[PDB]
Amino acid sequence: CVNLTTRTQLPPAYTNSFTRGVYYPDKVFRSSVLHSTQDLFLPFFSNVTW
């Protein structure tokens, strides 16, 4: 093991999430349909640390 110190500091940066972070909430197939689902998603146009 080792804990090589080698540490600096910098204020955090941020970037826009855009329309990303959406996943298939379940393993059910659906064809040509709009389905409404409540779940743990990434809000659109969110802050997103970098």
Partner 1 sequence: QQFGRDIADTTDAVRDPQTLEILDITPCSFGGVSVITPGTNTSNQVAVLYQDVNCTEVPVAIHADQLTPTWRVYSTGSNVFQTRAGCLIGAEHVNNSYEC
Contacts with partner 1 by CB under 8 A lie at 27-31, 33
Least separation, in Å, of the C-beta of 35 and partner 1?
9
Nearer to partner 1, 2 or 28 (CB): 28
**Rounded to whole angstroms, what are the CA distances from 40 to 14, 23, 25, 31, 37?**
21, 10, 9, 23, 10
CA quadruple 22, 24, 26, 31: dihedral positive or negative?
A: positive
Nearer to partner 1, 33 or 40 (CB): 33
Nearer to partner 1, 15 or 26 (CB): 26
